[PDB]
Scaffold this active site. Structure first.
Site, mmCIF file in Angstrom:
data_model
loop_
_atom_site.group_PDB
_atom_site.id
_atom_site.type_symbol
_atom_site.label_atom_id
_atom_site.label_comp_id
_atom_site.label_asym_id
_atom_site.label_seq_id
_atom_site.Cartn_x
_atom_site.Cartn_y
_atom_site.Cartn_z
ATOM 1 N N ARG D 13 4.399 8.548 0.326
ATOM 2 C CA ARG D 13 3.715 8.065 1.463
ATOM 3 C C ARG D 13 3.593 6.522 1.137
ATOM 4 O O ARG D 13 4.679 5.753 1.220
ATOM 5 C CB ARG D 13 2.350 8.838 1.355
ATOM 6 C CG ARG D 13 2.300 10.132 1.941
ATOM 7 C CD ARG D 13 1.127 11.068 1.375
ATOM 8 N NE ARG D 13 0.085 10.694 1.985
ATOM 9 C CZ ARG D 13 -0.543 10.712 3.221
ATOM 10 N NH1 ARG D 13 0.215 11.707 3.957
ATOM 11 N NH2 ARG D 13 -1.715 10.168 3.463
ATOM 12 N N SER D 135 0.464 -11.583 -9.056
ATOM 13 C CA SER D 135 -0.632 -11.115 -8.246
ATOM 14 C C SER D 135 -0.830 -9.907 -8.352
ATOM 15 O O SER D 135 0.104 -8.880 -8.584
ATOM 16 C CB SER D 135 -0.708 -11.872 -6.869
ATOM 17 O OG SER D 135 0.209 -11.128 -6.005
ATOM 18 N N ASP D 141 -10.038 0.076 1.736
ATOM 19 C CA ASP D 141 -10.174 1.032 2.955
ATOM 20 C C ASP D 141 -11.183 0.291 3.780
ATOM 21 O O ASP D 141 -12.129 0.176 3.664
ATOM 22 C CB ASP D 141 -11.196 2.440 2.424
ATOM 23 C CG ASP D 141 -11.070 3.485 3.399
ATOM 24 O OD1 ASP D 141 -11.424 3.102 4.724
ATOM 25 O OD2 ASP D 141 -11.015 4.744 3.042
ATOM 26 N N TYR D 154 -16.064 8.950 -3.040
ATOM 27 C CA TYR D 154 -14.801 8.196 -2.621
ATOM 28 C C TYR D 154 -15.145 6.871 -2.058
ATOM 29 O O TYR D 154 -14.429 5.925 -2.602
ATOM 30 C CB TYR D 154 -14.031 8.987 -1.407
ATOM 31 C CG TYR D 154 -12.877 8.118 -0.855
ATOM 32 C CD1 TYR D 154 -11.764 7.929 -1.378
ATOM 33 C CD2 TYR D 154 -13.139 7.610 0.368
ATOM 34 C CE1 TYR D 154 -10.969 7.104 -0.916
ATOM 35 C CE2 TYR D 154 -12.252 6.530 1.050
ATOM 36 C CZ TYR D 154 -11.114 6.550 0.419
ATOM 37 O OH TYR D 154 -10.028 5.701 0.851
ATOM 38 N N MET D 156 -17.827 5.238 -2.835
ATOM 39 C CA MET D 156 -18.379 4.563 -3.871
ATOM 40 C C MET D 156 -17.292 3.956 -4.724
ATOM 41 O O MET D 156 -17.398 2.571 -5.122
ATOM 42 C CB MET D 156 -19.046 5.413 -4.868
ATOM 43 C CG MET D 156 -20.509 5.744 -4.260
ATOM 44 S SD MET D 156 -21.367 6.887 -5.447
ATOM 45 C CE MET D 156 -21.837 5.979 -6.752
ATOM 46 N N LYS D 158 -14.304 3.130 -3.529
ATOM 47 C CA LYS D 158 -13.419 2.102 -2.811
ATOM 48 C C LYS D 158 -14.422 0.794 -2.719
ATOM 49 O O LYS D 158 -13.894 -0.265 -2.695
ATOM 50 C CB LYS D 158 -13.349 2.629 -1.441
ATOM 51 C CG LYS D 158 -12.162 3.405 -1.398
ATOM 52 C CD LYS D 158 -10.890 2.909 -2.134
ATOM 53 C CE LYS D 158 -9.429 3.718 -1.953
ATOM 54 N NZ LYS D 158 -8.042 3.275 -2.431
#
Ligand SMILES: NC(=O)C1=CN([C@@H]2O[C@H](COP(=O)(O)OP(=O)(O)OC[C@H]3O[C@@H](n4cnc5c(N)ncnc54)[C@H](OP(=O)(O)O)[C@@H]3O)[C@@H](O)[C@H]2O)C=CC1
Ligand SMILES: NC(=O)C1=CN([C@@H]2O[C@H](COP(=O)(O)OP(=O)(O)OC[C@H]3O[C@@H](n4cnc5c(N)ncnc54)[C@H](OP(=O)(O)O)[C@@H]3O)[C@@H](O)[C@H]2O)C=CC1
Ligand SMILES: NC(=O)C1=CN([C@@H]2O[C@H](COP(=O)(O)OP(=O)(O)OC[C@H]3O[C@@H](n4cnc5c(N)ncnc54)[C@H](OP(=O)(O)O)[C@@H]3O)[C@@H](O)[C@H]2O)C=CC1
Ligand SMILES: NC(=O)C1=CN([C@@H]2O[C@H](COP(=O)(O)OP(=O)(O)OC[C@H]3O[C@@H](n4cnc5c(N)ncnc54)[C@H](OP(=O)(O)O)[C@@H]3O)[C@@H](O)[C@H]2O)C=CC1
Ligand SMILES: Nc1nc2ccc(C(=O)NCCc3cccc(Br)c3)cc2s1
Ligand SMILES: Nc1nc2ccc(C(=O)NCCc3cccc(Br)c3)cc2s1
Ligand SMILES: Nc1nc2ccc(C(=O)NCCc3cccc(Br)c3)cc2s1
Lengths: 243, 250, 251, 248
Positions: D13, D135, D141, D154, D156, D158
């Site tokens: 992905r 870097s 998100d 999830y 929290m 991100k």
């Protein structure tokens, strides 16, 4: 005597609720209006009958123009004339309508949507501070949906973003003078409609005007004496809801 | 009866001021503490003298571990045990110390304490609060400076950012149960015990509104507002109480 | 044929750097200017000497007034008249000066210039750019990384840059169905004012975490180039700070 | 001497598109993976066919635990052992599933907070301690302020990652390490998701009524690691086709 507050567009809807609640809290109030003289005077009547000579009206058009500065000075002055002081400015008056990008002259739309929404607040803020222990504060009526705007409402959205900038810049600059500057950002309140009610997480309904007024009262109170440059959302969670 | 509130880390400083003011407003209070046994018991005494049977203490480590959920469940349970209800949760307890990226606790312990107390424990308390369920609400003590952080406080800042996400996520999810979730974000308030005085004045001078830190009472005032009947449409909101500090550029 | 871009206030500084880098990437450019007539023509000359008939100038005041719509319409028209198309609009032109709340120009002139150049003109140009469409169309707005931690006494400037954020979002939303992307680039400290002394410059430089120096014009231009490129084809309503970390530094 | 990059969750992905594009750009790559060994090796073989000795794999669970620190140090180590340097860290690996407020909860915490936040922090520490265009890029998100219902942990994680991005940018800026983020909106949808469900999501996106390709996300990553972003740190680029701008 008792402290004094100016509320712009105070004739109807959210501004009226703010005016009433400030009055109930023991402020003397200037009820600003543009078109709604009958409504303004009627509100003034109801408040003076409650407490003698504690409410006055003030007419001004808050469209941007060469005379806006004079109008804004006049609004602040009428508070000093009536009551001898001016503790609170609530910038509530606001124009709201679509301005499509792929399409009133545009410059009238600018004058209303940027003028009343952003420039008049800035001028009123200047006059308020120029004419100044006490608990001095300004409260700007912002918009909780500013980062997820209604389609084809760019100028409106631009004006409300500018009002955020004013809230922040004025809080910084007037803090040394003990003047606090804060905002209250409604979501769906009094509507132009159940489609929109259903979207709101907290209770599937709009805020009453009084709920908005509640947050204003808090911010003017001694319970908010350390609070400046803050914008309190009052939207029942609407701005948290994704597409 | 009177409504009931849990305040985490309520023995000293800001949590103490919050328990006091909730109490003065008519709440029965659970005073959560970790180490400050004496100060906790002392405050519950002071409140109970004022109105008997309106204050208990409840001891718990809020460090992340496989038993943190049971500890959090227990804090909430203690409120139901003492008062038969729990209307208000205040997530105030917080660890705060530097964790530099470039280098006497292990890093696994720093993670456990800074992410556990500031974020995981709030989440678990929230779950337990909601599962056990008038005017119900949760207030998280966030941080006005979270986007302009102190140098070398990455794990602390991460925990406070997570707490913002919790405030929003739980506001959205608990709204249909009539529970509101909001935050109060101090700037500089009660300054650390182990700090100088030329140095306290350094931080003081940066604050636009009055060149001073917030009193604990000033932070508590914002908590009172968010739990009150005046904030019934307010959820997912974080009120900064920072005297303009977050507005000041470098 | 080659795409064409309008760059506002492109005679000097960051706008020139953007026009130059767009030109090196293969764009034909309209160099808008207001007062910098000599510098604008000199730049077009330079660019035309590199490939002929690829640069024009276009004079317009971007102060707010009842004629600002016509002038913004004319800027866009200038691009179609020179190049037959307008692919990219960069809203770079900006007035910048103090407007203290607690007290040169009248206040209505300050409003006209700071709100006019920084927000109203971008809105009118956006409207004209969109309507004259009748490929990779996009608009890039030069924002300000420090809008939430403003300089003391710059309320009108800050109000205009906040409005430009709102335009960026509103226009990205509304124009996305037409294939037009709208994004922003937000410098922190870049080319310092020509007026400012070295003493002051170094004070501002020392605050920048990444290298204790201001952004070069080129570094700002680099982000604009990214946003107009095919590498940003799914990006709209985004504002990229190019500030060396400055906006993260507390007081 | 070609620069070297670590990509976490690189087997499939988005992380796969990132590794490929970094490789095409001239980087040697460590392909980190957890369960997808066959996909990871198959990617390494393809890249090594293109250019010999330019890709290695590295297996690690990024769940939070007492050994996570060790694991993250070893990931960074593998890049130095393989390539003699580590120029770029891409924190891509992520767990994502609902955690309703009303697996054990502590396993959910360990997985959602571990992969999304703690492992990034530990990798960032190990990266900087072992240290030019250096870097880090964190995959954030775009929808963190308008979260999915019942995704609190999830969300929290991100948000924590935003904090890391900012905090590490500030702290590593003196060492010349830039730290930035890329925030997708809707990108590659689950393989198993019915087309009719995929289309409900696609319809919501202003720009083109489709999800981002993995390559579109990787494009932003490539920009941030490039010499064209040399002044950019602490920035998070949304790559969301305007999704986050759409009201309820
Ligand atoms: N209502 C809602 O759901 C929302 C509210 N808000 C904000 O809340 C505030 C109050 O909202 P609401 O009460 O609905 O506002 P309205 O749209 O009802 O307008 C309030 C008042 O503003 C005055 N006004 C409008 N245009 C002008 C002008 N050109 N010059 C002078 N006065 C003018 C009018 O006074 P007069 O009648 O005397 O002419 C009017 O009654 C606004 O600032 C708004 O943006 C934000 C988001 C949504
Ligand atoms: N003070 C300030 O200037 C600012 C504070 N804040 C926030 O406001 C809140 C209150 O601030 P303040 O009063 O200074 O906080 P303190 O630093 O004084 O900590 C509050 C309490 O947290 C408890 N605590 C610490 N670690 C643990 C642990 N492992 N388990 C359980 N409890 C623990 C302690 O309880 P015990 O003593 O019983 O062990 C402590 O008294 C915090 O969330 C903080 O992050 C925000 C920014 C500014
Ligand atoms: N420089 C920096 O450090 C920072 C820059 N920015 C933003 O980056 C952009 C470029 O910055 P910079 O190059 O320094 O900008 P400048 O301040 O140099 O202004 C750019 C151009 O704006 C034009 N302009 C000014 N007023 C008007 C007007 N009334 N009508 C028409 N054009 C006008 C001028 O054209 P002419 O010379 O032809 O009259 C000028 O050359 C701006 O949007 C700025 O706000 C953001 C933050 C920091
Ligand atoms: N796809 C989208 O629409 C969106 C994606 N994002 C972000 O983009 C990034 C990439 O997205 P996407 O490719 O969809 O991610 P996936 O959900 O496909 O996960 C990527 C990889 O993460 C790894 N991973 C999961 N759990 C663990 C664990 N415990 N230990 C180690 N590795 C683990 C897996 O490795 P393996 O298979 O080898 O076990 C997996 O292949 C993520 O950080 C994500 O949150 C954000 C917005 C939306
Ligand atoms: N549990 C605790 N959390 C916190 C968080 C912050 C502080 C604190 O002292 N913050 C001040 C931060 C700051 C940042 C920049 C300028 C200034 Br004057 C002050 C103190 C504490 S104690
Ligand atoms: N048209 C123009 N717009 C702008 C906007 C900002 C600046 C500028 O120099 N901003 C820096 C202000 C700042 C704010 C905080 C720290 C530091 Br050092 C510097 C310069 C210009 S020129
Ligand atoms: N590791 C992973 N992290 C994430 C994060 C988010 C998503 C995802 O599908 N996001 C889209 C959420 C969303 C929310 C609202 C509208 C639309 Br259309 C899409 C998918 C994944 S997979």
């Amino acid at each position: 005597e008792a402290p004094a507050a100016v509320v712009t567009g105070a004739a109807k809807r959210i501004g009226r609720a703010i005016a009433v609640k400030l009055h109930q809290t023991g402020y003397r109030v200037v009820i600003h209006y543009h078109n709604s003289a009958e409504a303004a005077v009627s509100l003034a009547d109801e408040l003076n009958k409650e407490r003698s000579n504690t409410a006055v009206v003030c007419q001004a058009d808050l469209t941007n123009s060469n005379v806006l500065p004079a109008s804004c000075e006049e609004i602040i002055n009428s508070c000093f004339r009536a009551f001898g002081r001016c503790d609170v400015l609530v910038n509530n008056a606001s124009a709201f309508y679509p301005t499509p990008l792929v399409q009133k002259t545009v410059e009238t739309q600018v004058a209303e949507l940027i003028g009343t929404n952003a420039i008049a607040p800035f001028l009123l803020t200047m006059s308020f501070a120029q004419r100044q222990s006490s608990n001095l504060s300004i409260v700007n009526l912002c918009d909780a949906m500013v980062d997820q705007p209604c389609m084809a409402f760019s100028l409106y959205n631009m004006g409300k973003h500018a009002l955020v900038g004013l809230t922040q810049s004025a809080a910084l600059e007037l803090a040394p003078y003990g003047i606090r500057v804060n905002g209250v950002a409604p979501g769906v309140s009094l509507l132009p409609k159940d489609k929109w009610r259903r979207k709101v997480p907290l209770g599937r309904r709009e805020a009453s005007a009084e709920q908005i007024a509640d947050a204003v009262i808090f911010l003017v109170s001694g319970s908010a004496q350390y609070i400046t440059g803050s914008i309190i959302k009052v939207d029942g969670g609407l701005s948290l809801v994704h597409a």
